[PDB]
Amino acid sequence: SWQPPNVYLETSMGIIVLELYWKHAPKTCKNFAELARRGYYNGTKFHRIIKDFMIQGGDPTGTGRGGASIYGKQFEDELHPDLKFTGAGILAMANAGPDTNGSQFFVTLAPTQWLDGKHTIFGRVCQGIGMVNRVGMVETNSQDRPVDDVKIIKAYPSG
Amino acid sequence: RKRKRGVDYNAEIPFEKKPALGFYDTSEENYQALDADFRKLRQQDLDGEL
Amino acid sequence: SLQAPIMLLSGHEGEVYCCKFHPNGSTLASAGFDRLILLWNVYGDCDNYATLKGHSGAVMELHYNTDGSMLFSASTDKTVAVWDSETGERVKRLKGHTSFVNSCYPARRGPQLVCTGSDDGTVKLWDIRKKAAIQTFQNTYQVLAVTFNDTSDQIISGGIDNDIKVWDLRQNKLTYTMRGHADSVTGLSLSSEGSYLLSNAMDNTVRVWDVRPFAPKERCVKIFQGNVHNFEKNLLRCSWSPDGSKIAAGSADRFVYVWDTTSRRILYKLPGHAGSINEVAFHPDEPIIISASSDKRLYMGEI
Amino acid sequence: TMPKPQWHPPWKLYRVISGHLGWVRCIAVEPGNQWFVTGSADRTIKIWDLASGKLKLSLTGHISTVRGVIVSTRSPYLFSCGEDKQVKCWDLEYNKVIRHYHGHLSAVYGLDLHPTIDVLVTCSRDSTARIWDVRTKASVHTLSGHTNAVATVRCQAAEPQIITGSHDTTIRLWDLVAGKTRVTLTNHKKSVRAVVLHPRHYTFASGSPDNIKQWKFPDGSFIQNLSGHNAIINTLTVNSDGVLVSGADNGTMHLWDWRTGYNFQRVHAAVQPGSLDSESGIFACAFDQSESRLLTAEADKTIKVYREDDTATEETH
Amino acid sequence: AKTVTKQRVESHFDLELRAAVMHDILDMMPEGIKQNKARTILQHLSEAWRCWKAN
Amino acid sequence: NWEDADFPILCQTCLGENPYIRMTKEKYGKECKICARPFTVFRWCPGVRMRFKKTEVCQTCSKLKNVCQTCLLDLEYGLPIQVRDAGLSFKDDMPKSDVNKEYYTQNMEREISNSDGTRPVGMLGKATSTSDMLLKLARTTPYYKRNRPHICSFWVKGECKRGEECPYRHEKPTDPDDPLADQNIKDRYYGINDPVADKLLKRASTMPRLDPPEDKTITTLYVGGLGDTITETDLRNHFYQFGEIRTITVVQRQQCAFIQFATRQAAEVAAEKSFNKLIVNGRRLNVKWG
Amino acid sequence: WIPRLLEDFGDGGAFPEIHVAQYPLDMGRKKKMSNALAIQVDSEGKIKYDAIARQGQSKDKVIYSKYTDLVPKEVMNADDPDLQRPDEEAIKEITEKTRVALEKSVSQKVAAAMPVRAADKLAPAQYIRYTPSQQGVAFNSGAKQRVIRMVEMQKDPMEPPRFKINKKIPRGPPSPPAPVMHSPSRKMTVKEQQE
Amino acid sequence: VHLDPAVKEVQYNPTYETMFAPEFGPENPFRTQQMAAPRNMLSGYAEPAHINDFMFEQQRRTFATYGYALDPSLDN
Ligand SMILES: [Zn+2]
């Protein structure tokens, strides 16, 4: 029940540091920080990467349908009336429908209205937007899957 | 005119290959065409002195 | 387990209405519109050894005894064929119906009895030694699915009158009517214990009915949804797992449906059939499934 | 000294067979070491007794220079090709041509038999390879994509099933099923006129006048580079003991290790008596099935037969 | 694909000899030679054969 | 080369109003009306009083230009090709002269048969950027007057001796003194001087559209049809997309909302996005200048 | 707590609470129609300048475009399990697939050699289920799919070939050029150039 | 939650939880009605059916005679 600051990702392309908002949504922050702490993201990849939309990451199956949580497979959202999706860098929680959150994040690349219409803003990146941009510039295919592996190596719940 | 080919030369580009494109935006820029000047111009003037 | 999971089986030529696992679980019989009965291996390479002719119609319903000795075939030329499991001969052909025989079922553990239902409105009982019908029950309407209890004392019959009817052999009267289906019942299956009976119907609801001496009098035990019936009006069959733990039902949207019997939850929705499915069946020892569909092919799912 | 090579004994000539009236452009050994074929510029295929070196049979029928000859291991057949544009199939049961494979536009330079399917693959000067069904004499595919003449072809049962070098300095690794190129290897500066497949180690080498290059099969990875033998090399052949043989148009022939690529012997053989000093040259070489004889097909219209020297180590770098 | 029958034999021999010489001079020249001069060498081959027939 | 692919590429106004179709497949039946190479002709009947339509062009010549093989209209919108290229760019430039056409066809056939077989090989990236004026005159429900048997030319001479039995229509043909009558196949297919597409573009040009900020630097937006059922808290949630929003004056008495932005570019972009399109809370919001 | 520029963003990340239209690098709303194929980067390697080599190729094609393809591998000591022919049963499986693929093309070629001997037969009338991808229903009548029965049109035995096939066109472009991968190039002297 | 979203032709038997779990994330807005539909060749998905001849032609003539028929779509 503690509140760490920024989370250290260590991807294949570089080091992204994630500034996670504890006031607006502490429950997803405790989940994601705990999953980074346990060693859940060590070796998982950015399975879905879309050009100038976002980079979806975090799946031990690496499919985009798997994942679970510390609460178990789902928990409610934190649709806050202050957080709005504008601009690159914003870290978020991936969805399946109303209030169903596993262990999949996505860093946004562009201002989006339908997102903050129906998605949870986890936080933002603070140190490493260039590595985010280099990850965004990776070759994809029909269903937006990278040809190579853009995987995360290690993760730290720092601060 | 009664022939199969031959009118394909002025109508369009004969066996056109588009230039392979990439890493530099080449859609804005374009070239300025030739000044006609049809009151001095000669068949000798285009081909140049042999 | 046998070979590699899938083991797709072909060789059939028209629709495949029915299929049954051998009581030991080492061979297989498949049948359908082909006017042919095929006996194939479940192990090794699953290759044909016996082809059984002797019909002028579509082989609607297929069953076994509990020994794996006598093969019973209900065909669409108003006759039922009785064969031996090995050596392949026409042992006993029985002709009593005036219309198409939709289903047959052998009474198990008792003296040899077979009950059949046909489109003329008749539900008939058959002793294999007598060459004659034993008891005849005019319902009034077309009868699609017919089975016994374990005690060989009742006929559990499904028709197109939206009502499962249970006949007593001793009183020769309409004992039970079971209401709860909104459209015609196409397939019945009695469990390995005799406690429960599984039913498909055209209203797209798969129902479990407890057949007991003492009843709650409203026997709407378990309800399954997801099963699709369509314009093809096929006779859809259902099957129990050997331990009664899994439930299979054929569907007309080309998905193999297997539910869990306690949570009423769809365990398996296996794809891989181009045509609509007619009968899904469980291997008696091991979790292996033969699935039979109108795309002329058989599938061996290994769980 | 990064590697230490295996010690290979030196090879020495012991027999010079003579009797062709043209350059001997090809050679192949029967699967049972009873005889070997040669094909030559005098339009005859000659069957020679391998043990005694005696002319067993002389077959005629090509209109021009015979360029390639191969013996079938599965069927009792003999395939040949020429500058005739013709690809023939000889039934050795009858010593008569039974089938001709028609469709090449210019001179057929090489051929190889697929080892397991009954498929014949030929090269021509028309910048194409072709894939023939032996039983129906039909072109299955036309492997096109080279820009100059196509020098050589090898076949496999494993992946890339067809491998060819050509005179446009490139090598194309093909797909036999689709009929399209899978890998293009441009590493050579001059015309690839020889490729050879290894019996065990799943690599291949290729030769050109600049240098000889070794390569892993699935995607053509560069493994090594064997240099020092600088002439227009016509053939490469491999012994299962890892002896590469590289023979050239100047008549020189260098004996190499496969693994490390060490030049352990140079054999610059002498020409026939009537022959001319500019007429020294090798066009073809083969190992026997015992892999202890070395058959070379020379430009002085002779066959030379070599064997390993039984006088042990006098050697080691 | 026309066949070399009887009236094409000598012409096809001279068509193939000349191609063989083309391949050999493309492979014989060293690395930095101007890659012209094939026609001139083929003229010299024609002249050497006419001097051979002329003794 | 031949074409030979199963199951044609068809729209829904030609494939019929019956979900049960019986079609015949002829392997190399006709030659293409454009490509002039033979292809697989499929012949079906849509409904009851229809015409037995058949595919007119190759699979390949429909993959080039993303069209149906018999109405030659866009698979997604149902419009002529000149209208869709008007609401896009025109960078295909398919050759029309003879040898160039067969050469381009050969090379594009090798291009398509060296690929997957699913995408409109050149039209894809430009087909991402869409929803121009073509969506505001896209046909909503199928025009089943296309699938309709031709005028009985014996009834035109008043000599139709089949009478009531003739399967061809006994009704007036169109006056040939009409621009909407000539319509060559290649004119409909290359997107050149198609009079149907001309009329669709003349309608879509006189479609109501944005006006510029007549006076300099004014970003003021005059919102009529605002409505008294909506809230201004949702207005900013729709409007922070564009940029640095300035003050928003609200008058709920005349149902007019006044909007100011930072730059006039942002007001022009808002005019682009908003005018005659934007419906929020299921209620149309009209915006004007002045 | 002030965005206003790309300077205040230290190492980027737009703040999701300001309710303005800030964006760290230049992800402009009106990024103009550029025909430049986008600069793509590999996992931890360099900018793929390979993309201007594989223009008309696919994503599975193995082309060689870098200096590190010209470097000699090691001696690869002994009978290593790295350089091994795949497997005998895998080779037999490739052989079986290949011979079955080849025989079909053989039959389609050989069918010309006897065009009419026992002239052909055609009635496998088949069914196909098709999803219009147009839904929004006024289209089937209200349905999502449609079933189509395909019969193949019955061929006239007595009918000659229909269309001119002898039409002849020049050879199209070859597949995109491979990088040439030569060595540095030996220096040439005036003396040998003249000799 | 366990299998690839689309490859095809699985060699083992999956579960209902390992094949029909939804795909996560937001849908990309950079695709149209045709590009978002599960299509097989440029206009939709076409797969071989095995409907009985009589019932097919029954519903076909039912629509062609009166104007209605049962739905052959398999989920809808
Ligand atoms: Zn066409």
Ligand SMILES: [Zn+2]
């Ligand atoms: Zn159409």
Ligand SMILES: [Zn+2]
């Ligand atoms: Zn009329």
